[PDB]
Design a protein around this nucleic acid. Structure first.
Lengths: 167, 85, 205, 62
RNA sequence: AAUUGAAGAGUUUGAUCAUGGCUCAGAUUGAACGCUGGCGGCAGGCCUAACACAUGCAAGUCGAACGGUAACAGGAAGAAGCUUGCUUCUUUGCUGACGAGUGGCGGACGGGUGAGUAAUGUCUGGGAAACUGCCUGAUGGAGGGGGAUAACUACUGGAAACGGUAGCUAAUACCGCAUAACGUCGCAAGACCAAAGAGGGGGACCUUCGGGCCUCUUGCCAUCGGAUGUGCCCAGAUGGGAUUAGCUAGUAGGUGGGGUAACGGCUCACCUAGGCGACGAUCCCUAGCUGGUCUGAGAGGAUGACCAGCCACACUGGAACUGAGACACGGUCCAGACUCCUACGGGAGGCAGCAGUGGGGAAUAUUGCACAAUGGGCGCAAGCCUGAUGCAGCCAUGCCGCGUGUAUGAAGAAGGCCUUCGGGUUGUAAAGUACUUUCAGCGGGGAGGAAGGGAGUAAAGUUAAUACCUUUGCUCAUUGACGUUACCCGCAGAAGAAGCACCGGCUAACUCCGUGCCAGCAGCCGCGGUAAUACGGAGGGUGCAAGCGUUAAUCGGAAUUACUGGG
RNA sequence: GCCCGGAUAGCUCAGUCGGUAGAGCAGGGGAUUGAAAAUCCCCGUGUCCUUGGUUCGAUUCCGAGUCCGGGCACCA
């Protein structure tokens, strides 16, 4: 279409689609060059014409090659790939953590909304969905979070228990 | 598909028209004959037979119908116009 | 392909001599034969039965230098062939071209005779044969082409191989460097202290 | 299914796909397939000059 | 001359002998994986998603069937640069031939896959109610006309695809009439039905002077044949399950109408009330079948990938057309899902063809070359097409062969390791020395796979004819993708070429050190609790070798499903 | 690509406001035995990702880059 672009040596044509746009690379399904079709593994060279082809949404340019590192380099889109991957899986996992977290909400601090208030100003907390999107995704590591709910201070006797602990 | 054999399709398709056309002819005369059999007009039913005879035989020779088939029609039908008496 | 290693060591393990340093010197002390293949080797071993059948298979193939795989081939061919499969076996192993060459003694050893055949230096009926595993038919007249002929080593090797108890199931012009093969050796005339059935039964397992 | 992890110092962390081969452990109840160490995400054992084919370590030469 | 063929061990126990499961030794593979990696030959290579698919190619051919000629090469004929013969621009199918079009043949072959199928299939062996293009034997005919239509013109719809209307023209296209038969029907008498021309030559003669006419090769029509192919039929065999026992109403049979190449519920109407089922029907699951492959002494057991026969499918469901033949892989029509063009009205498409892409997976290659060889289509042929096929590349994936020096050589070197620290061992291995140089790397040579086919030529056959053409000999020019071939000759130089498992018993092979029921091993027994031959390293050993192990899978041992062969 | 949060000794984790980094659980040693168990006695484990600046005080402040995790565009 008329747009050259530098790409680190060892680069794969898949990176190239991601470079233009993740979805161009996500649903991507093969690309030709110089009027010849090539496997994703073929490394890109000296500013050759690109003849990429796309699809719909499903992404697996390296779902079976990502960690394998069997040609599908540069952390660029693959970074974006884990994103996508997680996003879906984490969504259903939101649901899982959803239920789990709710019982624990009523476990220590009791009441959902009450416990959700303490999480309102929490860790880059974002919307209430991100909350379960985090725990349901496991990227918040619990127990710490639990005690944070009951981070209540008082010491109207516990101060002397802190003396009894010393006794 | 787009492969010089689509002509075959066209050519064969054209034949369908003509082929079915002449085939229609054959069966319709025969119908009048079977129709003639309900009537009992054995003389003119025979006439109808005398009409189809050249027509059915001919189509057999043209290849539109395997000869043996013609033999069938004329056979059993002639048997019917004999028994109609 | 070929063991190509400390050849005298194999004689140490298998038992006595394996003709791997033929002629000029017998297994003369500076050989440490007896038993001492390795460190502990000098110590007393029992060698359970299977071990015996093994050592025989090993020793034999060691003499002919052949590797187990192709050796297995020799066994199967020895099997389908009629009569004493143990004997047909020795007939086959002994008829080997490079082995026939050591029999004419052109090569001081079976090994030296092997590279010899591998250098296309030798022929049969006037046909250069490079195959080490070449099998020799009866009445063949294996020769030595002029280009590779008369190369010191071979002739002195002949006078050397004369020390043996002479092959007797063939023919040779010796001085003219030109082997020949009569009939395949009768079991009686071929060592005969190298038990064979131990191998037949070995693969029988 | 559960899977045994062969040799000294594995490096796997929760995820990481790994090839799986047969062979019961005969020690651990209900465990059946050895993780093909040295393949894919499962890096071979560190220092294995002997019997390195198993355990995926390559020549010690390097 | 045409099989000479059969191994056991560990493990229950304080110990035994039984019984007996688990486990191992073996061979095997379309294999993957780790580690490693010299060459060649012959083989094999998507087993999972019958998942979707960009590009190219995989099926065209005949001008010797036809109207024609849009290109192209020339001729012939002309305005004409006019070197008066150096050739510019032009008209004409006149020949070589040749886009598009009609038409014959082909496309139903070849090639892929194994989804479906538990029997409409297959194998084995029987059978009668059949058809059969192309090839081929015989018998005869090949008479005489008509209407068209495509291309091509004009106009015109549509963005495209693809048409619409009017006109004109042809034929081995089609239709009729005639003409018939050892052909059809028919008791017979009778009734009735076919087609087509080309290309080469040519003397006499007639030439509405295109030609008729003689001849020739082929093509054309019919019938009876033969071969081949194909459809059909019956019996027997062809997985598992009874925790599937009743199943079926075109179902079982008859009669008659129809129908197919053909018998037949193959399909209808009418009548009978049956048919199948414990020798397993029906229902459910699974599966392409076989020749064969693997294993096994054998009987069996597992499987049926490459190769070969058959069957079924060809984007999913289905229908029919044309034809000898398909209910059609690269044909048609409809539907569906999915892709893509759009001017939103409508359209286009099917890699389970070869390569190739994505995806699935533990995993399986190059969008390579050529028509030279075989075979295939067509054409009389020359020829053209031929991802069939031949070859080539790829990958140790297997089987096979060879090579990674050879002989010699003790100070039994060094260094490494154990030491009962004398020594032993590594180990003739190294070094050195002399030797030969396979195959790698290099330089020149050089088959076979090539048979035919071509032009000329002679004779023979035919014939009115040294014609033409056919058949058969001689002549030159020839025809190889692989292919800087095979193989050989010569070249310099040890030079360019070794790993992997294992060493407690099973089972070939030991010690030192480190670690201490830990870290780790394991197929079974079990090892490790501060002296491990069993864990990790080392040295040395054993095995195997461009392979070695691991796992999966079959069989074997297992006479633990026993028929041979047990209780 | 740009912007922002997360690495606190073996696991879980504590404070992470310029302050001299704490435990829970485990884990090892000791008496005990052939070794454990039970019993009894005793303790520990840090670079606060890494880097360097302001630094008595930085581990949180500062920017850099690491890996973790979120957000939005980039459609040849």
């Amino acid at each position: 279409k008329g747009d050259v672009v530098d790409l680190p040596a060892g680069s794969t044509p898949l990176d190239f689609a991601y470079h233009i746009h993740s979805d161009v690379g996500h649903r991507c399904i093969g690309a030709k060059i110089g009027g010849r079709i090539v496997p994703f593994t073929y490394q890109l060279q000296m500013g050759d014409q690109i003849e990429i082809i796309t699809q719909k949404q499903p992404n697996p340019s390296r779902d079976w090659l990502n960690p394998n590192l069997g040609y599908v380099t540069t952390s660029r889109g693959r970074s974006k790939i884990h994103a996508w991957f997680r996003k879906q899986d984490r969504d259903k996992n939101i649901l899982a953590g959803r239920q789990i977290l709710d019982d624990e909400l009523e476990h220590l601090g009791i009441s959902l909304k009450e416990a959700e208030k303490h999480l309102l100003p929490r860790y880059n907390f974002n919307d209430v969905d991100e909350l379960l999107a985090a725990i349901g995704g496991g990227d918040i590591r619990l127990n710490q979070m639990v005690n944070f709910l009951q981070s209540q201070f008082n010491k109207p006797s516990a101060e002397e228990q802190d003396a009894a602990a010393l006794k | 598909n787009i492969k010089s054999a689509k002509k075959r399709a066209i050519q064969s398709e054209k034949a369908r028209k003509h082929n079915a056309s002449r085939r229609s002819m054959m069966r319709t005369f025969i119908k009048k004959v079977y129709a003639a059999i309900e009537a009992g007009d054995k003389a003119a039913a025979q006439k109808a037979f005398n009409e189809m005879q050249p027509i059915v035989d001919r189509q057999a020779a043209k290849g539109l119908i395997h000869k043996n088939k013609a033999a069938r029609h004329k056979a059993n039908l002639t048997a019917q116009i004999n028994k109609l008496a | 392909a070929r063991y190509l290693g400390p050849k005298l060591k194999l004689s140490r393990r298998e038992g006595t001599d394996l003709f791997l340093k033929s002629g000029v010197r017998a297994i003369d002390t500076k050989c440490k034969i007896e038993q001492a293949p390795g460190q502990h080797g000098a110590r007393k071993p029992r060698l359970s039965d299977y071990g015996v059948q093994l050592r025989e298979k090993q020793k034999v193939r060691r003499i002919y230098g052949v590797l187990e795989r192709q050796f297995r081939n020799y066994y199967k061919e020895a099997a389908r062939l009629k009569g004493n499969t143990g004997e047909n076996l020795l007939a086959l192993l002994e008829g080997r071209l490079d082995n026939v060459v050591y029999r004419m003694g052109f090569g001081a050893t079976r090994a030296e005779a092997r590279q010899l055949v591998s250098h296309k230096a030798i022929m049969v009926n006037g046909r250069v044969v490079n195959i080490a595993s070449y099998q020799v038919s009866p009445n063949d007249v294996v020769s030595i082409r002029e280009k590779a002929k008369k190369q010191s080593r071979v002739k002195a090797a002949l006078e050397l191989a004369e020390q043996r108890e002479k092959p007797t199931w063939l023919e040779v012009d010796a001085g003219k460097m030109e082997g020949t093969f009569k009939r395949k050796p009768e079991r009686s005339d071929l060592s005969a202290d190298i038990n064979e059935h131990l191998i037949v039964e070995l693969y029988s397992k | 299914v559960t899977s045994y992890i062969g040799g000294e110092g594995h490096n796997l962390q929760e995820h990481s796909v790994i090839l799986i081969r047969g062979g019961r452990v005969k020690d651990l109840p209900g465990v059946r397939y050895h993780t093909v160490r040295g393949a894919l995400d499962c890096s071979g054992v560190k220092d294995r000059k002997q019997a390195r084919s198993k355990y995926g370590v390559k020549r010690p030469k390097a």
